[PDB]
Amino acid sequence: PVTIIIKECINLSTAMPFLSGFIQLRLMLNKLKNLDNIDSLTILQPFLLIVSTSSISGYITSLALDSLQKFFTLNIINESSQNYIGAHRATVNALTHCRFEGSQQLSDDSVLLKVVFLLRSIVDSPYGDLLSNSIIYDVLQTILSLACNNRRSEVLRNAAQSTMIAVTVKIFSKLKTIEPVNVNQIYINDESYTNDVLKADTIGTNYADD
Amino acid sequence: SVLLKVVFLLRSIVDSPYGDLLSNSIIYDVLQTILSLACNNRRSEVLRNAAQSTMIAVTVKIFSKLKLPVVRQYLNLLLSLIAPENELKHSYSTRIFGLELIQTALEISGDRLQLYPRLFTLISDPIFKSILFIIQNTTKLSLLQATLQLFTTLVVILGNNLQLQIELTLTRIFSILLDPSIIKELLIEQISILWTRSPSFFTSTFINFDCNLDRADVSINFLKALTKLALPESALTTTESVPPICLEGLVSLVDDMFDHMKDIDREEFGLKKRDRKTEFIECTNAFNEKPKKGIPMLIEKGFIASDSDKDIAEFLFNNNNRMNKKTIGLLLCHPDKVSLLNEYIRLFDFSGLRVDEAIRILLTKFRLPGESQQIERIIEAFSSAYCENQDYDPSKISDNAEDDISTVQPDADSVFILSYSIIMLNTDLHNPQVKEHMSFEDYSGNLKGCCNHKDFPFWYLDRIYCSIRDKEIVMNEKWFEDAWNNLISSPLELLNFDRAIFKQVGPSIVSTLFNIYVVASDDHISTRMITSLDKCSYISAFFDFKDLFNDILNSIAKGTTLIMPLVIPVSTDAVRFGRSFKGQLNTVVFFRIIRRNKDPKIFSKELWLNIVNIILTLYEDLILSPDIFPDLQKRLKL
């Protein structure tokens, strides 16, 4: 379990500054034997800083995002890990603010699907139930922006449609567990219909926190 | 888009709980298609990335159930994917994708794989061939990275029982490392996790790998490679990042052995396997030499009952992997041990065995000697041994029985010419230097009138030729082996155990510690370097190691640089102290060693001559105060 964090820190260290957290982590990770009191927000923080930052190239972001997918799919972040809900809040919040830069190898359109798949895995998993309203709203805004935009390829749009039809199930299934508020008193509508609007695209080349 | 849709439907149906109720044959029919989607390159790249993600997910789902024919067929499919037999048809991308796939599949549930035998049989012989073969025969960096990814996972999770197969792989890395420019950097960078993760990997290796008789020595070899890699001269054949990894390995080793050192009593201390292994590995060097003087040396070690030729002949008989074969062949070639020549081959058994299998077995016993006249006696005893082993029945000789050994009753000349003719087949056919191909019919006709002035049974020679033709060679060092190059087909206690590490390796380690501290200019590396040297100095005190515990402080004393007119205490050899940070740093740790030392007798004569200096010269440059014992001064009223 402790292996898989230092492991792939080998892989993502190979990027020849912004990488200093990785060698700091490698010095931190040698003698633990387990994930007990390591402040689990910090152990994912260098990856979050890599994916959130816009200046650096896209290839390192692709490698980091694949590493993050491999992180979650193992289920290394156990429930017993300290402050895990904060870590998942941080990684979703950093995911929704993703940025990109032009690159010759691969394509940004190729690796946006990794963001979509990782978001789908995050929300669909039980871990997604311990998320706040603002970050999930930002996630839905980002996915809807990806779906609506015509600049990207139609296959990625189809992936966006698929994950949205997937995530309606998860968001509305909690509607069964929740109980009705108030005492069924008479209600007068006084809220707007068009106060909100579709957020403009940002991932590409160029009573809420409860 | 329809391919993406069917992939999403497959992921949803297989990840669902109802996916567990799919049949244990249809999953393979699924997997062939949805993995061929990943392998195919002409499709869009985003579709391939979707294929990689959903293969990772379905691999999690299928291998989580292992806690059943589907996984067997699956490992067969990955074996066909990764292994180099099908390298021509498959591309780099599909191969590496399968490689990280099997890495994930083993890593998720590798602990439980020991119990079930069929998967382990499929993972030992054919799978490990792939990761062994890729290291010598690759150029692209990503594939080597992925293979070392998988190999490090095997060592870190499944290194306990998967024991012998660690040997042949692990040596070969040094053959490419100790002996390509970026490949060495990749190897060193990816191997460090091996020592880092497992907490006491070197001690565990010395426990199971070294002191066991059958296995060779790797940990001592590992340190002997690393210490050579430590010096900056290795930067002429490696990148600047390589020495930091090796220094991290060495400092981690000494820090782990110091973390083992927290609370043990020295008086409480005052091997049961390696004690044999010492003289056992010593006698091979005498046998890998002019070995006449080593034979009476062997008897003195309480190994053999008596100096009779039967006992030494039996001794050379049993062991096959130990003695160097060419040296034993040359020993057998000498003409002054003809008694040993007669009696050693007597203990062979040719009952119910053919001559072809006899020669096939016997060529493995020694390399065929390249001498002209010395082989004439052995290639003759080859024939002469066979007369008494097979009991003679002259009244039961006939050609009616086909594929029969009892029918032939050759004399000495018959088996002599048979053996002399059989040896020529490998040079005639298998060797490539003979460009003119010789027909076998002329070779058989050459043997006219040989079976006691008569022809040998032609069916016998025909079957022997049919046997030997099966191993034709085209175009010798090890060019790999179809049979795996292995015979698989055929707190006080731990300190006591690793007591023997330093007596083998320690001088090399302290030499490694020095010669980089001097050249290194940076403060941060140097303070850690000298702290490591302090750790070795403490470790020397528990044990005896007089040479090490003398030489290390002698080197430090020479390194402190203490051995115009003066006036505050200015001196010719005080400004050198102030200007040199290193001179400041060695004195404090040196006098710390002198402080916490326990035994008085351990120091030597010339060290004592050294430490009367330092303090005398510091007096002579008026640095330290003179009244070191004011109590005796007050007692004398002086």
Author numbering:
A (entry chain A): 11 to 26, 71 to 260, 322 to 325
B (entry chain B): 164 to 230, 329 to 440, 455 to 545, 554 to 758, 765 to 779, 799 to 871, 889 to 892, 903 to 973
Q: Anything the authors wrote about it?
A:
The budding yeast homologs of GBF1, named Gea1 and Gea2, localize to early and medial Golgi compartments where Arf1 activation orchestrates the formation of COPI vesicles destined for the ER and earlier Golgi compartments. Here we present cryoelectron microscopy (cryoEM) structures of full-length Gea2, the yeast paralog of the human Arf-GEF GBF1, that reveal the organization of these regulatory domains and explain how Gea2 binds to the Golgi membrane surface. Gea2 and its paralogs possess an N-terminal DCB-HUS regulatory domain and C-terminal HDS1, HDS2, and HDS3 regulatory domains. The HDS1, −2, and −3 domains form an extended helical repeat structure that is contiguous with the DCB-HUS domain, such that the HDS3 domains of each monomer lie at the distal ends of the homodimer.
